[PDB]
């Protein structure tokens, strides 16, 4: 849930 | 114990062969928790390989596999997938999954041997 | 790329503190044995992970991440690895691992 969220978006929010 | 990751789908393959591990989950739902897969050669260190999000979908490798293994779930078994095409021998290694737990990797598989020879 | 892991001697009860090898986010500390799966001991630099002991411990000071094990017990003495995130490729890496051996 919130466990899993911030490398959620660290991942989602990669460009290169 | 309660939350738990049982690995399947190793052994033995050639060079330029295909294998499919499998990442069975249970105690929590896939949907909720997004899984990798780390890898490790004989007496070497831990190489993370890939990343999925079976809520939104995302995946991600690492460099050493892009283009070769594909990541997969299926929320309905809350099982996690590998498939290695093209497999080489500096493939073989002990494949494991893992949960995300903030930064960090909480809950973690046995293993399974992955030996890719002629 | 990847690599064994480097040596370092110990004696029981002495304190180590390692530290993690593009600067990162966050950082996550294992510990893993022979034939065993690893076992995470810190997370999001300074988390101590539930039911690991005490006697572990994370921390930042600028841009370089520790580990410390304020004093060993044989039960400790393991390889340690460190696992870096960061925005940018490769997003997730674990360093090369430490092998803490006892002193004999």
């Known amino acids: 849930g919130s466990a899993t969220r911030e490398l959620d978006e660290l991942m989602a929010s990669l460009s290169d | 114990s309660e939350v738990q990751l049982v690995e399947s789908g190793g052994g033995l393959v050639q060079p330029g062969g295909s294998l499919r591990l499998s990442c069975a989950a249970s105690?929590?739902?896939?949907?909720?928790?997004?899984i990798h897969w780390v890898r490790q050669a004989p007496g070497k260190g831990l190489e993370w390989v890939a990343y999925?999000?079976?809520?939104?979908?995302?995946?991600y490798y690492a460099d050493s596999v892009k283009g070769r293994f594909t990541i997969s779930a299926d929320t309905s078994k809350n099982t996690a997938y590998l498939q290695m095409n093209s497999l080489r021998a500096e493939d073989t290694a002990v494949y494991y999954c893992?949960?995300?737990?903030?930064?960090?990797?909480?809950?973690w598989g046995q293993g399974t041997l992955v030996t890719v020879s002629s | 790329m990847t690599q064994s892991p480097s040596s370092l001697s110990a004696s029981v009860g002495d304190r180590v503190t390692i530290t993690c090898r593009?600067?990162?986010?966050?950082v996550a500390w294992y510990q893993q044995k022979p034939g065993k799966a690893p076992k995470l001991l810190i997370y999001?630099?300074?988390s101590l992970y539930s039911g690991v002991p005490s006697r572990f411990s994370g921390s930042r000071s600028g841009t370089d991440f520790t580990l410390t094990i304020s004093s060993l017990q044989p039960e400790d003495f393991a390889t340690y690895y460190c696992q870096q995130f960061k925005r940018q490729k490769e997003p997730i890496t674990f360093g090369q691992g430490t092998k803490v051996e006892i002193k004999r």
């Open positions: 999925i999000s079976s809520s939104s979908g995302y995946t």
């Open positions: 999001s630099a300074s």
């Open positions: 105690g929590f739902n896939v949907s909720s928790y997004s």
């Open positions: 893992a949960r995300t737990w903030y930064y960090g990797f909480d809950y």
């Open positions: 593009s600067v990162s986010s966050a």
